[PDB]
């Protein structure tokens, strides 16, 4: 089976300046698209999913934001293990797990979800 894997890399790479043979003398490299790029029709929604979750998080109890924005990476460096969040908030551990569950619960009823749900397709 290694023959396939062997045979793959044995081919020397191809001159990206190969003329492709059109009337415009188009070269090969002129046709390889950028797949590392985020399309503006997407980056637009990313700037919108932002304002979406920010409005939905001001619809929670104040310490539910600081416990949710801490469990996910939102508007803070890194995400925090729920125990690390517990040390920040005196009463720790299982107490935080319910603050986590109930916040997703207030947002899951079709009144706050109506905006967020349309980011899934």
């Amino acid at each position: 089976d290694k023959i396939r894997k062997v045979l793959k890399i044995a081919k020397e790479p191809i001159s990206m300046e190969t003329p492709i043979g059109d009337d415009e003398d188009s070269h090969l490299g002129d046709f390889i698209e950028d797949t590392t790029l985020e399309l503006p029709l997407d980056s637009a929604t990313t700037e919108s999913l932002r304002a979406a979750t920010h409005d939905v998080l001001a619809g929670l109890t104040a310490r539910e934001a600081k416990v949710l924005r801490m469990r996910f990476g939102i508007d803070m460096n890194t995400d925090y293990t729920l125990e690390e969040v517990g040390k920040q908030f005196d009463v720790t551990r299982e107490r935080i797990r319910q603050i986590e569950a109930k916040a997703l619960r207030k947002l899951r009823h079709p009144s706050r979800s109506e905006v967020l749900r349309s980011f899934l397709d």
Partner: protein, 99 residues
């Protein structure tokens, strides 16, 4: 054929056309003169900045369009930004001066 926003080529951040919305229209030297013969200074700038080679402005545009603000925040085309590095990667020092 039509195309609002599509795919872009890796080496020159210019509209390339594969799957989905196709390649854009080519806006050549002669079409540029037309805008120069008109006063179309802005129509020209956006035509060769935000609407093509400007990797940053093109999405600052698309976001601004949907936001409802018909502004362009230009920046520099990649064709010329690459020519910096191409001239600079010869023995030639090419800079941008003053302020």
């Amino acid at each position: 054929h039509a195309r609002s926003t599509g795919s872009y080529s890796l080496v020159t951040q210019q509209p390339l056309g594969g799957k989905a919305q196709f390649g854009g229209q080519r806006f050549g030297e002669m079409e540029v003169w037309a805008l120069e013969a008109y006063g179309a200074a802005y129509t020209l700038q956006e035509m060769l900045t935000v609407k093509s080679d400007d990797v940053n402005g093109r999405t600052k545009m698309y976001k601004n369009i949907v936001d409802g603000n018909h502004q362009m925040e230009p920046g520099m085309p990649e064709s010329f930004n690459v020519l910096l590095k191409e001239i600079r990667s010869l023995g030639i020092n090419i800079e941008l001066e003053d302020e």
